[PDB]
Amino acid sequence: PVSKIFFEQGTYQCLENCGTVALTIIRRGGDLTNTVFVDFRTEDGTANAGSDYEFTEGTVVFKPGETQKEIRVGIIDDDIFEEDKNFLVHLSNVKVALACLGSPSTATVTIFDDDH
Ligand SMILES: [Ca+2]
Numbered sequence: 443p444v445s446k447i448f449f450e451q452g453t454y455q456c457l458e459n460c461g462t463v464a465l466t467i468i469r470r471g472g473d474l475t476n477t478v479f480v481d482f483r484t485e486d487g488t489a490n491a492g493s494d495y496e497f498t499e500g501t502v503v504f505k506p507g508e509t510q511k512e513i514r515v516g517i518i519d520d521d522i523f524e525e526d527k528n529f530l531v532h533l534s535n536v537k538v539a540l541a542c543l544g545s546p547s548t549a550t551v552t553i554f555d556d557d558h
Pocket residue numbers: 458493494518519520
């Protein structure tokens with residue numbers, strides 16, 4: 443019986459000025475009385491850390507009973523008009539009973555430009 447860890451949705455969106463984007467990680471399956479650890483980390487798409495979004499990483503803990511965890515990523519605003527850009531948040535290193543990654547364990551985040 444295997445706990446799976448995955449993002450609640452595979453795609454998130456925000457405007458450049460949204461300040462931060464919230465992402466939800468689900469735990470489903472197996473024995474929910476176990477504690478589960480999952481690492482997370484941003485990766486550039488066409489949007490770049492230090493420029494369009496803030497580099498973010500960490501470990502999330504699903505304590506017993508917990509099925510939903512929220513993580514936040516900083517979005518950087520500017521006043522230049524350009525195309526919409528995306529980046530990635532990968533999940534990894536799941537630790538418990540067996541727990542592992544499900545689908546999707548990468549979320550893609552599109553920042554929509556709000557200028558012009
Ligand atoms: Ca920008």
